Curated annotation (Swiss-Prot), chains A, B:
GO terms for molecular function: ATP binding; UDP-N-acetylmuramate-L-alanine ligase activity. Coiled coil: none annotated. It catalyses: UDP-N-acetyl-alpha-D-muramate + L-alanine + ATP = UDP-N-acetyl-alpha-D-muramoyl-L-alanine + ADP + phosphate + H(+). The gene is murC. Belongs to the MurCDEF family. The chain holds residues 16 to 319 of 480 of the full protein. ATP binds at G108, T109, H110, G111, K112, T113, T114. Pathway: Cell wall biogenesis; peptidoglycan biosynthesis. This is UDP-N-acetylmuramate--L-alanine ligase. Its EC number is 6.3.2.8. It comes from Pseudomonas aeruginosa (strain ATCC 15692 / DSM 22644 / CIP 104116 / JCM 14847 / LMG 12228 / 1C / PRS 101 / PAO1). It is found in: Cytoplasm. Disulfide bonds: none annotated. GO terms for cellular component: cytoplasm. The keyword Cytoplasm applies.
Length: 305, 305
């Protein structure tokens, strides 16, 4: 048993991480300047809450988690550093949660948010109530449960995030590879591409890499990936393909072709080929997980945008 | 359920990995040019064995493992590449085994082999029959069991190995950081040091980093490690220390000081302060794991060299 202490536990990105850790059985304490409904919920769920910051609040903690909104002058942080207690940024602890669950990491420069939401929507339609991470915020749509209760954790994997390479997913998507975040990698696109290869090799040999081969950079690195892979796209050589794209209103329809399955007609309330591709990525993951066609259809059409 | 196929399964570094995978419940097949006692043992334990190489041998495999002794012209490898089956080097699969066990990774430029052996010796004295990896070879001293049966996997972690950063240990030792393998890191020692920091951050936040602070480079990076750490050495500021070093024959005696424990007198059949330090590293790990003083004393004195 360990105690994790959160400095600023009421912050929007912190409260969700504390709740997941509570759900996993850890002792959780936290400090914040103001009591709120967020801190009362955490206390109801087993968190010890302190109001105001003082060195005593950090006593007994085996780890501190600190936001990007805390000075090092903060007495709790300073006490932990003096006693050699580890202090970890919010984002590393967030990435760490995937080690306890069946982690689905949605990587790619664009489309992570939509693809993660579609995945959550489909899993929920299949009765699975996943916890999912968008913009650093843990969520579980309509759940009557603590965050992290599901077996599944679906998270955006941002290549500009310092913890990108410490994610340990079971399944990983790569929607596309753009140059937006070259600065994270010394302004070198080739280094940025190599990071995506290393990220996919954090998968276990039984894992699954879900690769958009309509993106030329994803297609380029594909031969480098020594893990099971399923490819998707409109490309005629993709494993999972969309054909017969059409509109009926603000709703996009298309037919998805999958290995050893009959063609499946789906719709989504979102325009553009990039959202057809995001739907394909979702369909691959859901198919790999054994989710029925009926939940896939329901999950895709029910998502709004 | 997955099937792993080993090309050259009788090779010395391959047979042990196949046995561990069998113990974990996977289907395992393998090909080799010659039947031997190694391949008959694997067959007795559930492996399907083929003699000679041909593309048919790789059928149904979800992954191939290939030695560094196989041409790409090898028909089994070629068949797998055509069908998009993942082909992984022996060393990556070996590192992967740590994900299924309580992994203890013994890193550092020098002293990995001795320290790993001492750890195994002490754990065995405590009745724990660990599997351990030295020189790429899986071993379990005097075990009446399949490799990998123990909860514990103790392995050398070599910084020149391509899989160094894909190890997922629960505990990690760093004996020292030397410049021997700078070439692996573009001939830059500072890059080599940064890799050791990244390696220790593969630990979980509940993990343990065991750090020799007698090495100036290990002491330098220590403030960077945001994980629980225990330090050891002759330095007076080390958490776990050796004092009163003395000889009686070819046997080295010393007293180990540990936080909140009485001083403990130990001996080892090996000369030099580097083997006192390797013993300290062992004592820290064994103490953290709850192993008794009597097994620690027995494990250290029983090891020969
Ligand atoms: Cl491959
Ligand atoms: Cl720290």
């Amino acid at each position: 048993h360990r105690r994790i202490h959160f400095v600023g536990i009421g912050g929007a990105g912190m409260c969700g991480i504390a709740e997941v850790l509570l759900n996993l059985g850890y002792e959780v304490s936290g400090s914040d300047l103001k009591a709120s409904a967020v801190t009362e919920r955490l206390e109801k769920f087993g968190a010890q809450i302190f109001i105001g910051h003082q060195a005593e609040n950090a006593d007994g903690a085996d780890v501190l988690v600190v936001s990007s909104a805390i000075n090092r002058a903060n007495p709790e942080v300073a006490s932990a550093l003096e006693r050699r207690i580890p202090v970890v940024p919010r984002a590393e602890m967030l990435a760490e949660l995937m080690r306890y669950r069946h982690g689905i990491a949605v990587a790619g420069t664009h489309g992570k948010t939509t693809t993660t939401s579609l995945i959550a929507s489909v899993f929920a339609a299949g009765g699975l109530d996943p916890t999912f991470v968008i913009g650093g915020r843990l969520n579980a749509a309509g759940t009557n449960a603590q965050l992290g209760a599901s077996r599944y954790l679906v998270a955006e994997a941002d290549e500009s995030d310092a913890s990108f390479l410490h994610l340990q997913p079971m399944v990983a998507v790569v929607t596309n590879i753009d140059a937006d975040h070259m600065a994270t990698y010394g302004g070198d696109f080739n280094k940025l591409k190599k990071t995506f290869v290393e990220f996919l090799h954090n998968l276990p040999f039984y894992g699954l890499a879900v690769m958009c081969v309509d993106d030329p950079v994803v297609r380029e690195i594909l031969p480098q990936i020594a893990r099971p892979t399923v490819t998707y796209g409109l490309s005629e050589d993709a494993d999972v393909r969309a054909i017969n794209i059409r509109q009926e209103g603000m709703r996009t329809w298309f037919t998805v072709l999958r290995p050893e399955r009959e063609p499946l007609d789906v719709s989504v309330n979102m325009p553009g080929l990039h959202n057809v591709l995001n739907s394909l990525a979702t369909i691959v993951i859901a198919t790999d997980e054994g989710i029925s066609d009926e939940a896939i259809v329901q999950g895709l059409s029910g998502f709004q945008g």
